[PDB]
Amino acid sequence: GRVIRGQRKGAGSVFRAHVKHRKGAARLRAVDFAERHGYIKGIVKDIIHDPGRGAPLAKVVFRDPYRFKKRTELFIAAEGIHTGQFVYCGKKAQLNIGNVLPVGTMPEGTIVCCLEEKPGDRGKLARASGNYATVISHNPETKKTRVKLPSGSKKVISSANRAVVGVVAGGGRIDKPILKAGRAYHKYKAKRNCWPRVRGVAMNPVEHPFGGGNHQHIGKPSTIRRDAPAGRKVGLIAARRTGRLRGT
Amino acid sequence: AKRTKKVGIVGKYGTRYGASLRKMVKKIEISQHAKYTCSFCGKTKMKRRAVGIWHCGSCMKTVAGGAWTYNTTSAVTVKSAIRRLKELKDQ
RNA sequence: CCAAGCGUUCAUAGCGACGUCGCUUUUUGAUCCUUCGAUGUCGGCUCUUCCUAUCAUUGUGAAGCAGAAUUCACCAAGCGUUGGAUUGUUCACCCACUAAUAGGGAACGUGAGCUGGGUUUAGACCGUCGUGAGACAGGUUAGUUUUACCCUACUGAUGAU
RNA sequence: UUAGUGACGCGCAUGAAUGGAUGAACGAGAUUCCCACUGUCCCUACCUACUAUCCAGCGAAACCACAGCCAAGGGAACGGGCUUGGCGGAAUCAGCGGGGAAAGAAGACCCUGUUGAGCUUGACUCUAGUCUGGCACGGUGAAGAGACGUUUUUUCACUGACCCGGUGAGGCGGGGGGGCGAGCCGGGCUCUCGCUUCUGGCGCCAAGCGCCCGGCCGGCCGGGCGCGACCCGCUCCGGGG
RNA sequence: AGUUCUCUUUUCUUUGUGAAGGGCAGGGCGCCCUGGAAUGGGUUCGCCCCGAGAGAGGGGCCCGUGCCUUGGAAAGCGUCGCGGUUCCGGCGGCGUCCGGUGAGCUCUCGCUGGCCCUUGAAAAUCCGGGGGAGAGGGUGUAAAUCUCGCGCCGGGCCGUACCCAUAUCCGCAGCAGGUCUCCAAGGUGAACAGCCUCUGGCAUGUUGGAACAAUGUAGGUAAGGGAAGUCGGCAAGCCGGAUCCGUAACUUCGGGAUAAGGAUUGGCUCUAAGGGCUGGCAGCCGACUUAGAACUGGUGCGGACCAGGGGAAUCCGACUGUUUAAUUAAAACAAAGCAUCGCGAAGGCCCGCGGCGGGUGUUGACGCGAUGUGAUUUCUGCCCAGUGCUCUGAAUGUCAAA
RNA sequence: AACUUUGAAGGCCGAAGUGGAGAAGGGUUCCAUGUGAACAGCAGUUGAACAUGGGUCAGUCGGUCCUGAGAGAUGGGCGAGCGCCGUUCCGAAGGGACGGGCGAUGGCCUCCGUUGCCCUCAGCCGAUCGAAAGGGAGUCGGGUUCAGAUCCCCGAAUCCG
RNA sequence: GGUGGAGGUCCGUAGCGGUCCUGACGUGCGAAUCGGUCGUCCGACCUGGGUAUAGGGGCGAAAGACUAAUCGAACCAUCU
Ligand SMILES: [Mg+2]
Ligand SMILES: [Mg+2]
Ligand SMILES: [Mg+2]
Ligand SMILES: [Mg+2]
Ligand SMILES: [Mg+2]
Ligand SMILES: [Mg+2]
Ligand SMILES: [Mg+2]
Ligand SMILES: [Mg+2]
Ligand SMILES: [Mg+2]
Ligand SMILES: [Mg+2]
Ligand SMILES: [Mg+2]
Ligand SMILES: [Mg+2]
Ligand SMILES: [Mg+2]
Ligand SMILES: [Mg+2]
Ligand SMILES: [Mg+2]
Ligand SMILES: [Mg+2]
Ligand SMILES: [Mg+2]
Ligand SMILES: [Mg+2]
Ligand SMILES: [Mg+2]
Ligand SMILES: [Mg+2]
Ligand SMILES: [Mg+2]
Ligand SMILES: [Mg+2]
Ligand SMILES: [Mg+2]
Ligand SMILES: [Mg+2]
Ligand SMILES: [Mg+2]
Ligand SMILES: [Mg+2]
Ligand SMILES: [Mg+2]
Ligand SMILES: [Mg+2]
Ligand SMILES: [Mg+2]
Ligand SMILES: [Mg+2]
Ligand SMILES: [Mg+2]
Ligand SMILES: [Mg+2]
Ligand SMILES: [Mg+2]
Ligand SMILES: [Mg+2]
Ligand SMILES: [Mg+2]
Ligand SMILES: [Mg+2]
Ligand SMILES: [Mg+2]
Ligand SMILES: [Mg+2]
Ligand SMILES: [Mg+2]
Ligand SMILES: [Mg+2]
Ligand SMILES: [Mg+2]
Ligand SMILES: [Mg+2]
Ligand SMILES: [Mg+2]
Ligand SMILES: [Mg+2]
Ligand SMILES: [Mg+2]
Ligand SMILES: [Mg+2]
Ligand SMILES: [Mg+2]
Ligand SMILES: [Mg+2]
Ligand SMILES: [Mg+2]
Ligand SMILES: [Mg+2]
Ligand SMILES: [Mg+2]
Ligand SMILES: [Mg+2]
Ligand SMILES: [Mg+2]
Ligand SMILES: [Mg+2]
Ligand SMILES: [Mg+2]
Ligand SMILES: [Mg+2]
Ligand SMILES: [Mg+2]
Ligand SMILES: [Mg+2]
Ligand SMILES: [Mg+2]
Ligand SMILES: [Mg+2]
Ligand SMILES: [Mg+2]
Ligand SMILES: [Mg+2]
Ligand SMILES: [Mg+2]
Ligand SMILES: [Mg+2]
Ligand SMILES: [Mg+2]
Ligand SMILES: [Zn+2]
Numbered sequence A: 001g002r003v004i005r006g007q008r009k010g011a012g013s014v015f016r017a018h019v020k021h022r023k024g025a026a027r028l029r030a031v032d033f034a035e036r037h038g039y040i041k042g043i044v045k046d047i048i049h050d051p052g053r054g055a056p057l058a059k060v061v062f063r064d065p066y067r068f069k070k071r072t073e074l075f076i077a078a079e080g081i082h083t084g085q086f087v088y089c090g091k092k093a094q095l096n097i098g099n100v101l102p103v104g105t106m107p108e109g110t111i112v113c114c115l116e117e118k119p120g121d122r123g124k125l126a127r128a129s130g131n132y133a134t135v136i137s138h139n140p141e142t143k144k145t146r147v148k149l150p151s152g153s154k155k156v157i158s159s160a161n162r163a164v165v166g167v168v169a170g171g172g173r174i175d176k177p178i179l180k181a182g183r184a185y186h187k188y189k190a191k192r193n194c195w196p197r198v199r200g201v202a203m204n205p206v207e208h209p210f211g212g213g214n215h216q217h218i219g220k221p222s223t224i225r226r227d228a229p230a231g232r233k234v235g236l237i238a239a240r241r242t243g244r245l246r247g248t
Numbered sequence B: 001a002k003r004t005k006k007v008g009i010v011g012k013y014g015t016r017y018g019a020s021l022r023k024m025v026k027k028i029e030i031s032q033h034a035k036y037t038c039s040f041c042g043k044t045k046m047k048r049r050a051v052g053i054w055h056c057g058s059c060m061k062t063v064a065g066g067a068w069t070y071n072t073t074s075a076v077t078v079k080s081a082i083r084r085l086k087e088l089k090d091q
Numbered sequence C: 001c002c003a004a005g006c007g008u009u010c011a012u013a014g015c016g017a018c019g020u021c022g023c024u025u026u027u028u029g030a031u032c033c034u035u036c037g038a039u040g041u042c043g044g045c046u047c048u049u050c051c052u053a054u055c056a057u058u059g060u061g062a063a064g065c066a067g068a069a070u071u072c073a074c075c076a077a078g079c080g081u082u083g084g085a086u087u088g089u090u091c092a093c094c095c096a097c098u099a100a101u102a103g104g105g106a107a108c109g110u111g112a113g114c115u116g117g118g119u120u121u122a123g124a125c126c127g128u129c130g131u132g133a134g135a136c137a138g139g140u141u142a143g144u145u146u147u148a149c150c151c152u153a154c155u156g157a158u159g160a161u
Numbered sequence D: 001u002u003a004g005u006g007a008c009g010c011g012c013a014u015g016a017a018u019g020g021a022u023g024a025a026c027g028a029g030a031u032u033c034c035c036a037c038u039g040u041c042c043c044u045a046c047c048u049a050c051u052a053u054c055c056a057g058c059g060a061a062a063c064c065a066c067a068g069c070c071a072a073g074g075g076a077a078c079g080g081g082c083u084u085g086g087c088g089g090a091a092u093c094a095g096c097g098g099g100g101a102a103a104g105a106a107g108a109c110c111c112u113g114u115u116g117a118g119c120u121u122g123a124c125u126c127u128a129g130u131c132u133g134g135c136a137c138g139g140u141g142a143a144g145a146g147a148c149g150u151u152u153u154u155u156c157a158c159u160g161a162c163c164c165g166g167u168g169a170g171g172c173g174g175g176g177g178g179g180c181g182a183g184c185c186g187g188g189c190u191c192u193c194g195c196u197u198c199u200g201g202c203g204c205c206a207a208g209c210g211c212c213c214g215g216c217c218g219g220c221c222g223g224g225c226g227c228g229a230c231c232c233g234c235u236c237c238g239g240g241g
Numbered sequence E: 001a002g003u004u005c006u007c008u009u010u011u012c013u014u015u016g017u018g019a020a021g022g023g024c025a026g027g028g029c030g031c032c033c034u035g036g037a038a039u040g041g042g043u044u045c046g047c048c049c050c051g052a053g054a055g056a057g058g059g060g061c062c063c064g065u066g067c068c069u070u071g072g073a074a075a076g077c078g079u080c081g082c083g084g085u086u087c088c089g090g091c092g093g094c095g096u097c098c099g100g101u102g103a104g105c106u107c108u109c110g111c112u113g114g115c116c117c118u119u120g121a122a123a124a125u126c127c128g129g130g131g132g133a134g135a136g137g138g139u140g141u142a143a144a145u146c147u148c149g150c151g152c153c154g155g156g157c158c159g160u161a162c163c164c165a166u167a168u169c170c171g172c173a174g175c176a177g178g179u180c181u182c183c184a185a186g187g188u189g190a191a192c193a194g195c196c197u198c199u200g201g202c203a204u205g206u207u208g209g210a211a212c213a214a215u216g217u218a219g220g221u222a223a224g225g226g227a228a229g230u231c232g233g234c235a236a237g238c239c240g241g242a243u244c245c246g247u248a249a250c251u252u253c254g255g256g257a258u259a260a261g262g263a264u265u266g267g268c269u270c271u272a273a274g275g276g277c278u279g280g281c282a283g284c285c286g287a288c289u290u291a292g293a294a295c296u297g298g299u300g301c302g303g304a305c306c307a308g309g310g311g312a313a314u315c316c317g318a319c320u321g322u323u324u325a326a327u328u329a330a331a332a333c334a335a336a337g338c339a340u341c342g343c344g345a346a347g348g349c350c351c352g353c354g355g356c357g358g359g360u361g362u363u364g365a366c367g368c369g370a371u372g373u374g375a376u377u378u379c380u381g382c383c384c385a386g387u388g389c390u391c392u393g394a395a396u397g398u399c400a401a402a
Numbered sequence F: 001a002a003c004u005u006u007g008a009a010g011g012c013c014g015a016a017g018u019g020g021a022g023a024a025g026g027g028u029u030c031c032a033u034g035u036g037a038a039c040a041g042c043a044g045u046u047g048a049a050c051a052u053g054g055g056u057c058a059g060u061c062g063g064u065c066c067u068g069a070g071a072g073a074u075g076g077g078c079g080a081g082c083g084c085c086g087u088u089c090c091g092a093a094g095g096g097a098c099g100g101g102c103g104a105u106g107g108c109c110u111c112c113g114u115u116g117c118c119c120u121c122a123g124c125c126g127a128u129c130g131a132a133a134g135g136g137a138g139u140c141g142g143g144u145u146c147a148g149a150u151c152c153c154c155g156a157a158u159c160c161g
Numbered sequence G: 001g002g003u004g005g006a007g008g009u010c011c012g013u014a015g016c017g018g019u020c021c022u023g024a025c026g027u028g029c030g031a032a033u034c035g036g037u038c039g040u041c042c043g044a045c046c047u048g049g050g051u052a053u054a055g056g057g058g059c060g061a062a063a064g065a066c067u068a069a070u071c072g073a074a075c076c077a078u079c080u
Helices: A005-011 A033-037 A181-189 B008-013 B019-032 B073-090
Strands: A039-048 A057-063 A070-076 A086-090 A100-102 A111-113 A133-139 A144-148 A154-158 A162-165 B044-050 B053-056 B062-064
Touching (some): A033 A039, A039 B062, A111 B073
Parallel strands (some): A086 A100
Antiparallel strands (some): A039 A086, A100 A162, B053 B062
């Protein structure tokens, strides 16, 4: 057989991300003395559409505490922030939508977005439009916090991780039917070469495990073990169950 | 004169995509193209620029809002929750 | 061919058991002699010719031939043997006309004559089968039809001794 | 009416996202019928243009054992040649498609070959990857359980290898100094803080103070240092280990 | 200049002004000042605008490719007439004039809106502003300085012909194939349709002559019948524009729909209506339209061209889209929708001989990765024995090296 | 001399042209003169053939410069190795400057340049390549040749340094 | 009753494609062309140049398609 499409996606080539018109990587501020010990002020200059991303991005301007300069940051825009608003980042910022605070200082039940996976990484969790994490509890002895992620998993993270108060803007996006293949053509023309998707059973056995046959059938179970070699790991990968999810 | 009985704005789609999908998308199409009263200046000019981005033509303010509505129920609820936690945090 | 019977009677008008002798190669087989450095594979259409095991017509013999109609047999293939619905069909069946609507061969006549509906490549669907790739004298749909100016034959056209 | 449609259904072998049933709109998709229309046909005819045709000029190619009239015979079981008969008369033109089992391509069908290749798998033999155990890099210290001061193992820690993240490696650890609170008989401490949150301004390249020094005539002109901007430290800061 | 037998104050051709500078129209302003508006008003084809300041007044700015002016009439062009060696930027006369109009076409500038789960480059390069380190002279012989007006010097290197396609390119060729662009007249007409014409171009497509047999290829026409032909209406034929009327089943209420089915259409002569400018009126200008009526022809009139046959059903696929370049355009593929599966980053999936390697990833579960089904509507039953996948494990059979 | 040239008729393309100009490609096919051997599937007095000679002129039109998707060295890593990965990532990555102080040289020797050192100041953070359709200052009118012209000549301008 | 002008909307040109005639041609004009008739024609649209992916590899709205007239594994030289 030949190399299957899933195998070919890894080599880059025609499967690389379309990043020509993107505005930059969205991140928090790099952690420095002001955020470690106090707060720093910023002003929301603009809120912009980012090609390929559902959530809007906010362009925030800070003062440089060591040089006569203005620093432009590119944040995930929490819902409800507006241009000309002041946002504040640091240990002693106040609990307001759009401010950046360590999760250790936030009371239980706070709703946050663009949360750091590790202290200082500048925001990695709950960045998709409409999403957010929640604060469950703190352990000041171990200096750690328990948060609930948009997938529903609960994670233990360092209390020093920063986050933005509120939920990401642009929520409810998936509630609209696309209605058109052409509208899905445009959705992914901004993202990457992944659309449309041809089915495994619709190919020949040379390019897919499910291909071939005088009937379009899988022929073999579609739940494939976790350790199957690349080019065989297709279908339901390491599925714990299958069928209709009935119940809780 | 009333030109359609029930399709309304989704009459642009003719007979395509099915009644239920056209019925669903009608609710969004009205909301995402509405002009909302701006809370900063009071003029009915808040209009969607892109998904999640709402701009007022009068005072020029831009707001991070919902995908198809100006503010989402989830975001409105979170603001009150964050407001309540702020009071308890400093009492 | 024999003749037990049938035929009210009566074996043989017309039939004919139990037996038995042949003929034919328009059925299917059996065989594998020719062709695998290829003889174009069904059916229809078109066109000519030939066979007789005669359906009609001419001339006849026999009837359980009164007439009418019909049946059996003789010489006999000159001339005919049609229009249609369903089917790719050959075959079949029905409608209708007719004197009659007989049966066949010619490389199962005839694709450098056509057509390409079927079969019989590659696409695709269904059912059964197979773990599968795939398979199915099981259905279904779409799927390139090449050359003659040579020789002969034939048709006409100049001509030759 | 072996067609179509509607019913029937013990359905060789229908059936539920190997999706079942439906249904508007749409289709160079498959099928049946009806109106209209007509040369599809009965049943063919005529007309136009370009050919074919004949001429001047110019001019290939495919193909070819020798060739080129038949009947029958026998024959590798369908003869152009052979046997026996019928018969045979130069050189040619336009057509034609019966024959040359015509040309075209070492048959794709079928079989054989100890010839392959694409694909599959419960074939045989392997293999990248992947999971798993051991050894090395590979260290420091407390406890628990063992074995005879050593040694194996479990847990908990450590950092310095090793890894990860951030940054223009910009304020880290400890102490000092200062502010609000508490409280014991003004002082000591429990112990916390490090000066920015109203507004879509501005914000660097030192003010001030203290101490030295130079040039010119106490006065002018101009420099250096320190405090302002606390001190000491061994990994930049974190996260792992 | 053409026509002129007859008519035609006729028909045809032609009737300029560059860049740059100055001025002025015109266009635009989300620019300013006064003022304060409901009996709300202003206003567009649509919109849309206002106590966060509307109307109304008075200003400011930007573009001015338009006109005038310098350029510049000296040139160019038209026409008439003279000269030369006569291969002269030859010399002279006259002229290059005055108005109208338009959903017209092409280009451009501008205003305003719609669409996006699409938001539609970067850099060289140039400019303005904020700040105020500094510099400049001591009343003059003025200084620092000047993005103002003149003036002075220079701008090297490579390309530049021609073809650009029924004969200059690629298909072996002057090959009916292929091969990226710009400009774009009159008539008819909805029209960049087809048909005819002007400017410009060409010589019929690698030959001619003479015939007018068959068989062809490409066009036509056929009495009576009307699919009887054929596998099958293949092919051809019918319908066709526009106006007026009229329009079913079914339907996802959007359609179906040009459903189906009718009537009308020429020419000529009229009538009415639909506007602008100047000063309920008067005068002067005008642009094509629509409707109606009479008359009229051998019932011919969308006269050529252009230009849907229709209906009743069944199967399949929802649709638009795609596909086997060169035998299959489809019911196949995709699709929105639907449902599963993995993954919280020392991660999932994947690449790579190799690493502190690489793609997703400028990403973070409303995400990325892997499958099935295939819009909507309605539903999706029972089976975990088999084969898979998955979860628990010292409780524990087998189990390598060390 | 059917085919060349001139004149005259009759026609066609019919501004989405058989018209007028370019890009890519060609490479002299362009223009003048001559030939009529070969070639231009008849002919030719003709041709894009052959032969003999000419023809392309720029500050202002392009390239040249910028960066784009991307390509690609160095540091580093990997690699038996030719090498490969990688493009800011494991790097002492600045050879610059207003100004100030010390000197040295010169000249319109008055005092200013230049020049050496020291002080002071200094993100760019990625060499380089990448478009004759993107970005990118500034040229227009008239005349002129057999063949070139927004390039030559005449006139009138303009950008950069 | 008007205004308005949406649409993977409809007729239809350029363009792009290539249904049927199973038409022409089939030692062709052509190693795929020609005619009529046809599909679509604001979009999942058409197209130039630049750039990226290279052979058990790429690329594939999936036909084993395409990858220089070569594709169920290109072409070139060698082993030979
Ligand atoms: Mg395989
Ligand atoms: Mg397939
Ligand atoms: Mg008896
Ligand atoms: Mg044999
Ligand atoms: Mg034998
Ligand atoms: Mg043979
Ligand atoms: Mg034969
Ligand atoms: Mg006889
Ligand atoms: Mg036969
Ligand atoms: Mg034959
Ligand atoms: Mg044949
Ligand atoms: Mg067939
Ligand atoms: Mg087949
Ligand atoms: Mg099965
Ligand atoms: Mg019938
Ligand atoms: Mg039935
Ligand atoms: Mg089920
Ligand atoms: Mg089934
Ligand atoms: Mg001749
Ligand atoms: Mg022979
Ligand atoms: Mg002899
Ligand atoms: Mg023959
Ligand atoms: Mg043969
Ligand atoms: Mg053979
Ligand atoms: Mg062979
Ligand atoms: Mg053997
Ligand atoms: Mg093999
Ligand atoms: Mg192979
Ligand atoms: Mg095995
Ligand atoms: Mg006003
Ligand atoms: Mg003059
Ligand atoms: Mg200033
Ligand atoms: Mg030129
Ligand atoms: Mg002709
Ligand atoms: Mg000629
Ligand atoms: Mg020619
Ligand atoms: Mg010809
Ligand atoms: Mg007739
Ligand atoms: Mg008639
Ligand atoms: Mg019939
Ligand atoms: Mg028949
Ligand atoms: Mg037809
Ligand atoms: Mg209908
Ligand atoms: Mg049904
Ligand atoms: Mg379809
Ligand atoms: Mg494609
Ligand atoms: Mg094909
Ligand atoms: Mg086809
Ligand atoms: Mg499934
Ligand atoms: Mg099970
Ligand atoms: Mg041209
Ligand atoms: Mg030209
Ligand atoms: Mg010749
Ligand atoms: Mg020439
Ligand atoms: Mg490299
Ligand atoms: Mg460059
Ligand atoms: Mg350029
Ligand atoms: Mg000049
Ligand atoms: Mg459309
Ligand atoms: Mg259409
Ligand atoms: Mg054909
Ligand atoms: Mg022929
Ligand atoms: Mg695409
Ligand atoms: Mg590869
Ligand atoms: Mg196949
Ligand atoms: Zn507002």
